[PDB]
Structure 1
Amino acid sequence: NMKRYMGRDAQRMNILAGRIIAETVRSTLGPKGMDKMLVDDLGDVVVTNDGVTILREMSVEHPAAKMLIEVAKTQEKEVGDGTTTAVVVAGELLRKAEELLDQNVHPTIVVKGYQAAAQKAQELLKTIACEVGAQDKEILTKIAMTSITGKGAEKAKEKLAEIIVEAVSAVVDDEGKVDKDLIKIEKKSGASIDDTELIKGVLVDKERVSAQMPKKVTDAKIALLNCAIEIKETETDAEIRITDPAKLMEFIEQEEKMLKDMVAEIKASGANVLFCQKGIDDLAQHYLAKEGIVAARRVKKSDMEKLAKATGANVITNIKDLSAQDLGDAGLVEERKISGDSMIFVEECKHPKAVTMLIRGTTEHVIEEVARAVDDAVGVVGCTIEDGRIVSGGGSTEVELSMKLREYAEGISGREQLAVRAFADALEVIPRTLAENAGLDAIEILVKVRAAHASNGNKCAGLNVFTGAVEDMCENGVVEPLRVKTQAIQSAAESTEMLLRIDDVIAAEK
């Protein structure tokens, strides 16, 4: 019952099917891209702009499509959004090989061509790289503004870019390995995007441990405890053997003394706020309250980590080693209710190594996609400070790229010319698809812009989709990180190279 594909059969399936996946998602590309609604088997509803979410959620059957998950997953780790860009070009590359395969051009020649094209593209990528001010926050923000496109919340790119770039600039480390996961994205539905804000510290989704404890403490002295605040029990099994009535109270009171004195030791640190990863004994809560100590229980480990990054406090295992010099600082620690939801807010931190962006919004889908938009911008900004070099975006540079690729094809010649020239031909699909999704005549845009664009020193001329005509991309600030174009485009092809080597598909049906 399972189908078996060899040679041309496998080619027809792999090419058409992967192309069909691309044909499905091609509409999502860029400022003019639209969105998709995916509902799973259990009936749960997801609204997405994200290609990876689309691929990982859609019930993908053909292996060749499943390959795109691997590529897009890597694209997520490096560049974030715009993966549609790579997919669409690959779809054309599949079509371009189909045409050459119909001529019976040897598959290894096509791949040989793409390898040479990758090497030549690397040179071209280094050539198009525009050096920019590595520390200029405002221009960096301008890049972030372009980064915030292809979602409906770019109307507020003003505040949004400010928060996102500020957050990244805050976490800048000597070494580029800066992990954007050190910037927390906190989601809370309710209200609208207008209430979104930057917290120079951390928001903890927990409740005040005891109702009687202070609700707000300004210059807090933060302690981090990962141990439970209870009567400690040994690892070795042990049992009390009582032989006299008074012992009943002596041992009960001993546990009272161990807890109480342990709390006195907590108090002896000077701590005024204490975060516990595990639980807190009811009586512990009582004494801590009487000691004026504000407590948070069962704090999620990753939150414990961000607390350390914000306050400077170190997680202590043994209270006996806990001293005042182990305490961290926060300009304000306060218990807050947002949309009536009790949470513990760590704000105004002195020298936070991590920060948290609070996102507000009308629905779960709103806050999911806005939060996703923030992660996306944050990734590309991170790359932008990681290599202070950019290129114009919007499909404009790919014209200049194909421009000289055609020259290489002419200098190479023969059948290899076909493979490289076809690559170049596919490289132009990006502006072509943008134009079509923008509702414009793509032939008009490509011909006319290509004519203007080529012109030796007219590099930045691209398409303005708002006025629907050729325009200088530079002054409008339509640019992209060098890294995003670099890794996405080159890898897009290099992964296809393996698919092109496939001449036999033997697949069982699940």
Structure 2
Amino acid sequence: QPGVLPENMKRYMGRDAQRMNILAGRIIAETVRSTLGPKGMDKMLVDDLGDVVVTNDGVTILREMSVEHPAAKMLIEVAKTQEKEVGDGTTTAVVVAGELLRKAEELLDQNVHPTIVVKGYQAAAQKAQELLKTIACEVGAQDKEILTKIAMTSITGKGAEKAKEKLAEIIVEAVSAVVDDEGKVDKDLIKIEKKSGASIDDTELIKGVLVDKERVSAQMPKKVTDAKIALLNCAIEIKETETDAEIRITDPAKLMEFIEQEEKMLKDMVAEIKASGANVLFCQKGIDDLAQHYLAKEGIVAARRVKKSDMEKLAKATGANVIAAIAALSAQDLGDAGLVEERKISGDSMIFVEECKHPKAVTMLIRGTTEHVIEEVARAVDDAVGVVGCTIEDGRIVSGGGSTEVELSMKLREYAEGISGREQLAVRAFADALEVIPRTLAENAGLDAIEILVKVRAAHASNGNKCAGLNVFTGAVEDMCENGVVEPLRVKTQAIQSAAESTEMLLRIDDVIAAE
């Protein structure tokens, strides 16, 4: 008496640790396999409040399930990083990790030691990164035709794919518009708005922003063209000093005299705004009810208490500087928009700031018939925005449809040849694992994976076509590049690296100690 390790504790050692980690990995991957590719299927997730999510999106599915198992959670990180770094290929990354674990089990069940597997996987992964660089094709950041294929490939298999061609052109225009002066893409600069409507086809690109506000006074113009826009973050209210101040009145004449001073300085603020030439104003803080009246009189459209996020989008869009002192307001701080207009959209009043010339932020207004139909269109739009952004930044793409995984697998087996000993088993195992992609694409399409894999391999053999993959509709193997099925290099480099690193980490584990 008594126990050295805590009594309320579960433990799994050696084969049992390897087993639960590997198993949990595999089951997580099996959960999303069927979502993969053109013939992929969707999941309906219901949470404990009864709120529902319907999606094809790998990382969304994994986040929404309430996975508690520790090894499963390790693999879900693979999807989260894929989502952050690329914005697409989350199912792929996770499915590859799952297969890496499966492949490793057959090695462990041969008494190949875990460190040897981990070593072979590291070597295979590193070789894979070198091979991907030679496999990739270069593209120019302005090649709208290729960018459009990138986007269409991304949206294929989603639901929104009925509206694929129009969506993809919008997306390409949207991303091109926010590329910065170092050639980087901040996807935060593409504002997403989701509004029910007549159909998915009504989705449009707005060169500018939607502000969920109404002008502060009905007397202001509802619409203004070639507007001159003032952006203020100071409140258009009576200015108080920071030092504590109080007025003392002893003469009943000074009563109205202070009142009249306060309303003149208010009228002075408005006159200072009018003076800049502005005819549209967005104030981040509040505007005095009296200033509203004056503004209304001077024919100036104004919205108050605008969230900072919008203020910042407005600046990017119209080219205005957010000014912090009314006194400092200058005509050179004003932004420009073709049209500013208060409109109802699906019974919602909003201020459209649109038709800006070279906007640095833009808005995609996504339409659809129901809330849930729109939700899934928006996820597909995000995938596409992500991959178009990667392509513009990296200027490297690869063919899709599992073509690249097959070329990769084949080259890695060549490389395994020159590896001595057991490590060779692991390198081959890594090679074999990548084929889970072509195999899964075929399965989901109801095709026979084994025989299609034989054809696709033979089309890669010798100096074959690195772009050869299975067309899931025809059933033929085809030049995926020529059919416009393409993906950014970054999808694959990230997915494979993530899969390798997280599985290497899991395979190093020989002991699981769970509390409670």
Q: Shorter-chain TM-score: which interval? A: over 0.9
Residues 177 and 358, structure 2, Cα contact 8 Å, conserved in 1: no
- The 2-side partners of 1:450 and 1:457 are apart by 9
Q: What CA deviation, in whole Å up to 9, does each residue of 1:302-346 have, x standing for no partner?
A: 111111111111011111111222211111111111112110001
Residue matched to 2:512: 505
Kindly state the Cα deviation for residue 397 of structure 1 after the two structures are TM-superposed. 1.7
Q: Secondary structure at the match of 1:198?
A: strand
Kindly state the Cα deviation for residue 493 of structure 1 after the two structures are TM-superposed. 0.7
- The 2-side partners of 1:255 and 1:442 are apart by 80
Q: 1:478 to 1:282 in 2, by over 3 A?
A: same
Residues 201 and 347, structure 1, Cα contact 8 Å, conserved in 2: yes
- The 1-side partners of 2:59 and 2:481 are apart by 30
Kindly state the Cα deviation for residue 255 of structure 1 after the two structures are TM-superposed. 1.7
Tell which deviates more after alignment, 155-164 or 65-74: 65-74
Please say if 1:157 is aligned against 2:164: yes
Q: What CA deviation, in whole Å up to 9, does each residue of 1:190-226 have, x standing for no partner?
A: 2211211111111111112111100011011100001
Kindly state the Cα deviation for residue 147 of structure 1 after the two structures are TM-superposed. 1.6
Kindly state the Cα deviation for residue 508 of structure 1 after the two structures are TM-superposed. 2.0
- The 2-side partners of 1:268 and 1:218 are apart by 19
- The 1-side partners of 2:467 and 2:104 are apart by 30
Residues 274 and 294, structure 1, Cα contact 8 Å, conserved in 2: yes
Kindly state the Cα deviation for residue 237 of structure 1 after the two structures are TM-superposed. 2.2
Q: What CA deviation, in whole Å up to 9, does each residue of 1:114-147 have, x standing for no partner?
A: 1110121122111101123442212321222112
Kindly state the Cα deviation for residue 8 of structure 1 after the two structures are TM-superposed. 1.2
Kindly state the Cα deviation for residue 421 of structure 1 after the two structures are TM-superposed. 0.6
Kindly state the Cα deviation for residue 36 of structure 1 after the two structures are TM-superposed. 0.9
Residues 132 and 388, structure 1, Cα contact 8 Å, conserved in 2: yes
Residue matched to 2:4: none
Residues 453 and 462, structure 1, Cα contact 8 Å, conserved in 2: no
Poorly superposed stretches of 4+, deviation over 3 Å: none
- The 2-side partners of 1:463 and 1:250 are apart by 85
Kindly state the Cα deviation for residue 492 of structure 1 after the two structures are TM-superposed. 1.5
Residue matched to 2:111: 104
- The 2-side partners of 1:262 and 1:305 are apart by 23
Residues 396 and 461, structure 1, Cα contact 8 Å, conserved in 2: yes
Please say if 1:62 is aligned against 2:62: no
Residue-pair matches, total: 509
Tell which deviates more after alignment, 114-123 or 175-184: 175-184
Q: TM-score, normalised by structure 1?
A: 0.97
Q: 1:414 to 1:66 in 2, by over 3 A?
A: same
Q: CA RMSD in A?
A: 1.5
Residues 18 and 91, structure 1, Cα contact 8 Å, conserved in 2: yes
Q: What CA deviation, in whole Å up to 9, does each residue of 1:452-473 have, x standing for no partner?
A: 3324222222111111232221
Please say if 1:464 is aligned against 2:460: no
Tell which deviates more after alignment, 453-462 or 137-146: 453-462
Q: Secondary structure at the match of 2:140?
A: coil
Kindly state the Cα deviation for residue 277 of structure 1 after the two structures are TM-superposed. 0.6
Q: What CA deviation, in whole Å up to 9, does each residue of 1:426-447 have, x standing for no partner?
A: 1111111111111111112112
Residues 150 and 384, structure 2, Cα contact 8 Å, conserved in 1: no
Kindly state the Cα deviation for residue 46 of structure 1 after the two structures are TM-superposed. 1.4
Q: What CA deviation, in whole Å up to 9, does each residue of 1:481-510 have, x standing for no partner?
A: 11111121122111211111111111224x
- The 2-side partners of 1:457 and 1:467 are apart by 21
- The 1-side partners of 2:106 and 2:90 are apart by 25
Kindly state the Cα deviation for residue 102 of structure 1 after the two structures are TM-superposed. 1.4
User: Which of 446, 449, 462 is matched with 1:439 structurally?
Assistant: 446
Q: What CA deviation, in whole Å up to 9, does each residue of 1:277-299 have, x standing for no partner?
A: 11111111111000111001111
Residues 29 and 82, structure 1, Cα contact 8 Å, conserved in 2: no
Residues 88 and 383, structure 2, Cα contact 8 Å, conserved in 1: yes
Tell which deviates more after alignment, 95-104 or 247-256: 247-256
Residues 80 and 90, structure 2, Cα contact 8 Å, conserved in 1: no
Residues 234 and 326, structure 2, Cα contact 8 Å, conserved in 1: no
Kindly state the Cα deviation for residue 22 of structure 1 after the two structures are TM-superposed. 0.9
Residues 159 and 376, structure 2, Cα contact 8 Å, conserved in 1: no
- The 2-side partners of 1:135 and 1:151 are apart by 26
Residues 188 and 360, structure 1, Cα contact 8 Å, conserved in 2: yes
Residues 207 and 342, structure 1, Cα contact 8 Å, conserved in 2: yes
- The 2-side partners of 1:300 and 1:191 are apart by 29
Kindly state the Cα deviation for residue 83 of structure 1 after the two structures are TM-superposed. 1.2
Residue matched to 2:353: 346
Kindly state the Cα deviation for residue 474 of structure 1 after the two structures are TM-superposed. 2.3
- The 1-side partners of 2:464 and 2:394 are apart by 25
Kindly state the Cα deviation for residue 265 of structure 1 after the two structures are TM-superposed. 1.5
Residues 79 and 488, structure 1, Cα contact 8 Å, conserved in 2: no
Q: What CA deviation, in whole Å up to 9, does each residue of 1:239-260 have, x standing for no partner?
A: 2222232232222222212212
Residue matched to 1:394: 401
Residue matched to 2:5: none
- The 1-side partners of 2:38 and 2:140 are apart by 26
Kindly state the Cα deviation for residue 423 of structure 1 after the two structures are TM-superposed. 0.8
Q: TM-score, normalised by structure 2?
A: 0.96
Q: Secondary structure at the match of 1:219?
A: strand
Kindly state the Cα deviation for residue 451 of structure 1 after the two structures are TM-superposed. 2.2
Q: Secondary structure at the match of 2:392?
A: helix
Q: 1:134 to 1:255 in 2, by over 3 A?
A: closer
Alignment gaps of 5+ in structure 2:
1-7
User: Which of 372, 385, 392 is matched with 1:385 structurally?
Assistant: 392
Q: Secondary structure at the match of 2:246?
A: strand
- The 1-side partners of 2:136 and 2:218 are apart by 58
Kindly state the Cα deviation for residue 150 of structure 1 after the two structures are TM-superposed. 2.4
Kindly state the Cα deviation for residue 61 of structure 1 after the two structures are TM-superposed. 1.1
